[PDB]
């Protein structure tokens, strides 16, 4: 143990300014210069010292009775003072600058060790911590997990960010929750052995072959966001999934999801999807993300009557009206589509977040009773009129209307054109294949504020 044989000032034990100030409060003293006894130090069994700007834990070796510490979000490098604190069972030390965890090697009573967002490469010091049930090492610089092979009580594990070889996990069949996000993994064959997994998070890897997951029927949560998935046939066996994230892949064929009726959250953004008919039976869905795909016909969503969040930005949708049956909808995102008519949104009065920029919207009147809106986007609409004949004098009507139904006068007009409500007129010196105008007006719906704006293109026939 580390002990004092005479009462000693706090700041001669705890040399870090912020830690001495914290210990002054913990030990019930008035000043960091006040003396404490070993009996005072012996009282401290938990220490919550997160995000205080602590650079050193020098002095904590004298808190012999510590069982739980939180030094997360500090500037720690050296953790030598922990080396003999053998009553420690839980350590939270995420978001520091730790590289050397050799001081942890003999802390064999540890059951929980959280070290994500550090500078750890060498995890050999963990190899004898066999009572660990929670070990978090994500956002480090680990390339080798050999040291984990004997941690046969682990239930929750994360690591990163350079691991290629998952073979050291083979005997860790107690694992229930695994996060291998942000490594260099293509081969997940070893995960077939982890039959107790309930949650697998594996984002930002190089996975294409998911056949090893077929036997993991206890999975309720799966994320393979940011991989190389195309054929997702294996997922048809995962009938207990409720929460699935396949975003940022190469998936076109959703048929293997069509029987997964326990799904309530399904994230499919940034894939190759043109047909969502296989989702029409997933009636428990509350959250569906389909941004960054090839969608046009979204009629299958009309059956998904429990939807509360729906994302569709960056598709080719011109008919939003299948959403009219989604009475529970709160969030509706469809920036960068071809929607002109928003009449079908008029009775979706649970909407609190509407993002509809860069569509073809010219008339906001249907939105007037969406009083729960707090976040709103309506800018940068664009549409092209049917062509008219070129001649020096061209006149077209304006039909842009704000939420009140009032016409919105143009903000700018191309080619020196002018406006006399409701007509825009140009005097063109010579043929040009198109003229244009813009509009831009602040709009508030509920508590949400945006710019309603757009560019209207008028093609001219030679």
């Amino acid at each position: 143990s580390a002990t004092i044989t005479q009462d000693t000032p706090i700041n001669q034990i705890f040399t870090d300014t912020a830690l001495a100030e914290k210990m002054k409060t913990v030990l019930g003293k008035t000043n960091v210069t006040d003396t404490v006894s070993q009996t005072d130090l012996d009282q401290v069994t938990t220490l919550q010292a997160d995000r205080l700007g602590i650079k050193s834990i020098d002095g904590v070796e004298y808190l012999n009775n510590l069982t739980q510490i939180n030094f997360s979000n500090n500037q720690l490098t050296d953790i030598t003072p922990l080396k003999n604190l053998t009553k420690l069972v839980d350590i939270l030390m995420n978001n520091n600058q730790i590289a050397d965890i050799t001081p942890l090697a003999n802390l064999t009573n540890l059951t929980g060790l959280t070290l994500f967002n550090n500078q750890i490469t060498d995890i050999d010091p963990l190899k004898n911590l066999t009572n660990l049930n929670r070990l978090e090492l994500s956002s480090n610089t680990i390339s080798d997990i050999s040291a984990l092979s004997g941690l046969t009580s682990l239930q929750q594990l994360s690591f990163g960010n350079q691991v290629t070889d998952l073979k050291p996990l083979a005997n860790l069949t107690t694992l229930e929750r695994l996060d291998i996000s942000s490594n260099k993994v293509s081969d997940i064959s070893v995960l077939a052995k982890l039959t107790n997994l309930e949650s697998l998070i594996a984002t930002n890897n190089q996975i294409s072959d998911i056949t090893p997951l077929g036997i993991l029927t206890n999975l309720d949560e799966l994320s393979l966001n940011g991989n190389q998935l195309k054929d997702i046939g294996t997922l048809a066996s995962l009938t207990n999934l409720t929460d699935l994230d396949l975003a940022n892949n190469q998936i076109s064929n959703l048929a293997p999801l069509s029987g997964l009726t326990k799904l309530t959250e399904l994230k499919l953004g940034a894939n190759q999807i043109s047909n969502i008919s296989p989702l029409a039976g997933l009636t428990a869905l509350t959250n569906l993300e389909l941004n960054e795909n090839q969608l046009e016909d979204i009629s299958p969503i009309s059956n998904l009557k429990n939807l509360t969040y729906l994302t569709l930005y960056f598709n080719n949708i011109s008919d939003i009206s299948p959403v009219s049956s989604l009475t529970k909808l709160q969030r509706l995102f469809f920036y960068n589509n071809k929607v002109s008519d928003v009449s079908s949104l008029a009775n979706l009065t649970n909407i609190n977040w509407l993002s509809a920029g860069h569509n073809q919207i010219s008339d906001l009147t249907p939105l007037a009773n969406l009083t729960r809106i707090t976040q709103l986007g309506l800018n940068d609409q664009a549409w092209t009129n049917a062509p008219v004949n070129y001649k020096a004098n061209v006149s077209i009507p304006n039909t842009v209307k704000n939420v009140t139904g009032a016409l919105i006068a143009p903000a700018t007009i191309s080619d020196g054109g002018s406006y006399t409500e409701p007509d825009i007129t140009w005097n063109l010196p010579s043929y040009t294949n198109e003229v244009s105008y813009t509009f831009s007006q602040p709009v508030t719906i509920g508590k949400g504020t945006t710019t309603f704006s757009g560019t209207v293109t008028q093609p001219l026939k030679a």
Partner: nanobody, 119 residues
Framework: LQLVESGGGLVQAGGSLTVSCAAS????????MGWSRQAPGKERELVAG???????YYADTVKGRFTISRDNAKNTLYLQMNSLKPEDTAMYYC??????????????WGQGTQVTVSG
């Protein structure tokens, strides 16, 4: 997800400046990331957003002048600002976003970096 903005500075109108956003954590690589700005006594404005795939949103105030980019390998977001105007003077902030083109009710914008444009 921890974010730190840098690269703020003073530039004359017409000039270029790049701000950067360094992220710590696995969430950056698979999050929509955005830049917002706030001038004193003015409302926060979403300037730009970018998806992992690389689709972008730009506010009307900056379209054609600003370019948002990401380097997932460096966990860094950039906002390259060209043809800068005095009206671009603000604190610039980065955050992970739920939407490409709007901000949520309570995003984590953290500390920011000051950009000042002189006339």
């Amino acid at each position: 997800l921890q974010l730190v903005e840098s690269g703020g500075g003073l530039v004359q109108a017409g000039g270029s400046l790049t701000v950067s956003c360094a992220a710590s954590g696995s969430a950056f690589s698979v999050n929509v990331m955005g830049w917002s700005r706030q001038a004193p006594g003015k409302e926060r404005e979403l300037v730009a957003g970018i998806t992992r795939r690389g689709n972008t949103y730009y506010a009307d105030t900056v379209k054609g002048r600003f370019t948002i980019s990401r380097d997932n390998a460096k966990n860094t977001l950039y906002l390259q600002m060209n043809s800068l105007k005095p009206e671009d003077t603000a604190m610039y902030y980065c955050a992970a976003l739920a939407d490409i083109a709007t901000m949520g009710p309570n995003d984590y914008w953290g500390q920011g970096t000051q950009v000042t444009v002189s006339g």
